[PDB]
RNA sequence: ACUCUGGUUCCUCUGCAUUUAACCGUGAAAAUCUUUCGCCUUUUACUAAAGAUUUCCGUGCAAAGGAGCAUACAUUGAGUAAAUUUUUGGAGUCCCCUCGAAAGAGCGGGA
């Protein structure tokens, strides 16, 4: 982000897919934590 | 009877994908310029909207050439195989009057 603000875009939109990914997949008797491992929304934004 | 060609899979070149309501992309970046908002003692890097252009990750089809695999001649464009009332298994023949040298023609007449 140093050296391209613009970035901030992205940066925002992984932690938005984040909410959303965690919050349909914490859900029953999946807690708060690590382990969400669905990787592929994040890393879409960073291959655009 | 004519000329027309082997299937598949892959590589690469060339051309086209504008009458967009809308869509070569059921996905989604970056830049430049012009303008308008917000940061701010400046510029860069920025905010977030408009308009105009670019670059980049990709797409489709046609056509040509090549490269691998196992193997088949047909088949495309041009063009093949019924004696019972309505058609293709005979209601057909023959003979007088008329106009005209000539040969036909009248819902002509007769067997
Ligand atoms: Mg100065």
């Given at each position: 982000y140093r050296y391209k603000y613009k970035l901030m875009r992205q940066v925002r939109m992984c932690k938005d897919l984040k909410h959303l990914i965690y919050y349909r997949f914490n859900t029953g008797p999946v807690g708060?934590?690590?382990?969400?491992?669905?990787?592929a929304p994040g890393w879409r934004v960073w291959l655009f």
């Open positions: 708060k934590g690590p382990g969400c491992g669905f990787w």
